[PDB]
Amino acid sequence: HHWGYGKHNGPEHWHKDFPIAKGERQSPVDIDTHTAKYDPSLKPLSVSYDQATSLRILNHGHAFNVEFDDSQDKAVLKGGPLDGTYRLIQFHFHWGSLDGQGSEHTVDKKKYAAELHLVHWNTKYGDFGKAVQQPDGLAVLGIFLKVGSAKPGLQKVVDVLDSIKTKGKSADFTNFDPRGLLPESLDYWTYPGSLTTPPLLECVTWIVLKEPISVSSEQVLKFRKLNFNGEGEPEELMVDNWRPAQPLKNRQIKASFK
Ligand SMILES: [Zn+2]
């Protein structure tokens, strides 16, 4: 027995094993566009992914991660509300069983078909493990996905999903350029939050892009064919692996645009 997204081990149950689930800076949250404050002091985001080195893709049971080599400053995020350099370590998604749900963050209560998370850690802390124990340890770039036209740069990812259908499976995944997953504009909203899966540590500085990217129905359909279960176990489709919006509490959401 362990956490998951089912009726008996879902988000509503996590607080029992991870008390911080009821914390003061939990994520995701609903972004109220009319209450978010424009902050002129916010610097533009600086994304340097030209030297990114992807290594592998694996199904860990709650989603699939594309891992990158983070032994050097190859793919980094700087600027915006960030102080220092943050290295990209992995990216993953959160999707639904239907196109009307799947994203973790919501905009004026609107849900998107999926949400992409690019996770980076503050180099000042030496490694990811130490970074998660700090309030400014991680920076996660959130991108919404809506169903429409196909996204060319995403196809490489969808075509290998068949090789990592079940929990525990991994496959070599080299030379993937994450730049093909970014929208045209880099305008964003930002707020202090947490990881959206256990251990739910409150070490994240969220950067949610205003502009979603479009993916085709066929592309998202392939995501839905993945399994939560391991090989040789009853098939349980990997869908709705998203956590519901949490109370904003004592926090303010800032916007880089007005
Ligand atoms: Zn995530």
Query: Does the annotation flag 1 for ligand binding?
Result: no
Of 91, 110, 76, nearest to 176 by C-alpha is: 91
Pairing of strands 64-68, 54-59: antiparallel
Q: Is 9 left (phi over 0), alpha (psi -120 to 50) or beta?
A: alpha
82 phi and psi angles, rounded to 5 deg: -85, 145
**ω before 28 within 30° of 0 (cis)?**
yes
55 phi and psi angles, rounded to 5 deg: -120, -50
Q: What does the block give as tokens for 100?
A: 């009307």
Q: Which residues contact 98 (CB under 8 A, 6 or more apart)?
A: none
- Give the residue numbers marked as catalytic: 62
> How close is the Cα of 242 to the center of ligand 1, in Å?
8
Resolution limit, Å: 1.9
Q: Is 132 left (phi over 0), alpha (psi -120 to 50) or beta?
A: alpha
Q: What does the block give as tokens for 203?
A: 């070490």
DSSP 230: B
> How close is the Cα of 92 to the center of ligand 1, in Å?
6
Query: Does the annotation flag 117 for ligand binding?
Result: yes
> How close is the Cα of 199 to the center of ligand 1, in Å?
12
Q: Which residues contact 9 (CB under 8 A, 6 or more apart)?
A: 1, 2, 3
Check: CB of residue 167 under 8 Å from CB of residue 230: yes
Q: What ranges make up the beta strands (E) of 80-217?
A: 86-95, 106-107, 114-122, 138-147, 170-172, 188-193, 204-209, 213-215
For 13-24, give one letter per residue: b (16+ CB within 10 A) or e: ebeeebebbebe
Query: Does the annotation flag 197 for ligand binding?
Result: yes
> How close is the Cα of 93 to the center of ligand 1, in Å?
6
- 34 burial level (CB within 10 Å; 0-12, 13-18, 19+): exposed
Q: Could you give the maximum distance between any two Cα atoms of the chain, in Å? A: 55
Structure-solving method:
X-ray
Domains of the chain: 1-258 (3.10.200.10)
From CA 26, how far away is CA 31, in angstroms rounded?
13
